[PDB]
Design a protein around this ligand. Structure first.
Ligand SMILES: *[C@@H]1O[C@H](CO)[C@@H](O)[C@H](O)[C@H]1NC(C)=O
Ligand SMILES: *[C@@H]1O[C@H](CO)[C@@H](O)[C@H](O)[C@H]1NC(C)=O
Ligand SMILES: *[C@@H]1O[C@H](CO)[C@@H](O)[C@H](O)[C@H]1NC(C)=O
Ligand SMILES: [Ca+2]
Ligand SMILES: [Ca+2]
Lengths: 289, 145
């Protein structure tokens, strides 16, 4: 129940300005010692939590690595940047802490966190996609992991997350975003004898790729055929007529209900940042072939 | 210049079992306190790092202010349970690692492994079979293989 509003009062009580960041999941040490105050309701406009609504009086149990910590505005060097992307609004995400540049882990990363990060950097927020495209694995610290954002927070560090600097992640699984006006996203089928049969080819911000068939079925193929205007899908293969160039980037889909108007409306699709080698590309044959 | 072999030597010296994980950089605090042993080459079997061979005591110039750390087998809250079965002795195996519950790969799973799991859980070991009965695939991580 550590809301941001009464974290500002804690920063204000120490004459250190406002609470620029909240130390998620006991950043500044492990919880050695008992507790006195918990679950108090403070509006955040008060000068001190002492003269605030105490509400109920009760004691519960909390994890010894799940206690409170705050970062005040005076001791703030935090910033966000994108590195090694196709454009300025895409690439690997990095967070500056303690005068050091470090990445973000991909666990718990979904479109809700991407929307906060894209909005924070000032990039367009029309279509926000997870995954680092075109980038490589990071070098150095891994500051954040398992970030949980509802979707309205002003900055990433305000959200729920783990302790800074300690994570089980590896540099291979590094987090990135792709923020778009929704102008640059294009879909095509190539190599099948017409525009309604072939291999699904994507081109997001002038970079060519494909879609991995790990979770590819007729329900997901129906959205693509509907998007292109070629009717409903029939089979997940085709008869070849030409050869299609090879690309390194990939698009990953979680699942689609099947009634979406476009592929970009399917939830939590990842552009890049992962390689699939035990699977192949996705192929369709619509009914208007 | 920390490595997985170094943690195994440290764990074995403390009689804490095997190194399940190690924490790098300034994981458990900013570099502070006297720094004594860095950049020593161990073979992964010696009892203690000082007893293990090295380029020389104090032969290290470390920077960046990083404090090493290690989590061992007894340190880890390793736990086992069976989920989504007909009874308490059937279902899908799950192992708690790093505080999060995860499943196990099917590769190399046979009756000898199931024999250990049934005994460990306290379930009867008269007849032990592999297979998750009617349980479904989990969504968490896959810790073991
Ligand atoms: C990504 O593509 C950009 C633009 O073509 C290029 O500058 C960059 O080096 C690429 N990154 C890689 C290959 O990691
Ligand atoms: C698609 O179906 C889902 C599940 O019933 C529903 O929530 C959603 O509103 C539907 N979308 C459209 C565009 O009809
Ligand atoms: C498996 O069967 C048991 C016993 O009837 C039932 O409780 C459980 O829900 C079943 N699991 C699934 C995934 O259907
Ligand atoms: Ca991961
Ligand atoms: Ca999240």
């Amino acid at each position: 129940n550590f809301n941001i509003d009464h974290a500002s009062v804690i920063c204000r009580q120490l004459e250190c300005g406002s609470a620029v960041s909240f130390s998620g999941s006991s950043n500044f040490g492990e919880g050695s010692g008992p507790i006195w105050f918990d679950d108090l309701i403070c509006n955040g406009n008060e000068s001190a939590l002492w003269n605030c609504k105490h509400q109920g009086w009760g004691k519960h149990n909390c994890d010894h690595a799940e206690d409170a910590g705050v970062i005040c505005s005076k001791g703030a060097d935090l910033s966000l940047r994108l590195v090694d992307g196709v454009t300025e609004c895409s690439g690997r995400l990095e967070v500056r802490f303690q005068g050091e540049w470090g990445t973000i882990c991909d666990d718990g990363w979904d479109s809700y966190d991407a929307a906060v990060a894209c909005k924070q950097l000032g990039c367009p927020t029309a279509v926000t996609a997870i995954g680092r495209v075109n980038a490589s694995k990071g070098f150095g610290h891994i500051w954040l992991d398992s970030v949980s954002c509802q979707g309205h927070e002003p900055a990433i560090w305000q959200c729920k997350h783990h302790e800074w600097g300690k994570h089980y992640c590896n540099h291979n699984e590094d987090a990135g975003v792709t923020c778009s006006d929704g102008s640059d996203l294009e879909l095509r089928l190539r190599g099948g004898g017409s525009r309604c049969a072939g291999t699904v080819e994507v081109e997001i911000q002038r970079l060519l790729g494909k879609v991995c068939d790990r979770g590819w079925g007729l329900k997901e193929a129906d959205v693509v055929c509907r998007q292109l205007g070629c009717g409903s899908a029939l089979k997940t293969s085709y008869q070849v007529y030409s050869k299609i160039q090879a690309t390194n980037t990939w698009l990953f889909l979680s699942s689609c209900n099947g009634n979406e108007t476009s592929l970009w409306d399917c939830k939590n699709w990842q552009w890049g940042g992962l390689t699939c080698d035990h699977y192949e590309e996705a192929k369709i044959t619509c009914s208007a072939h």
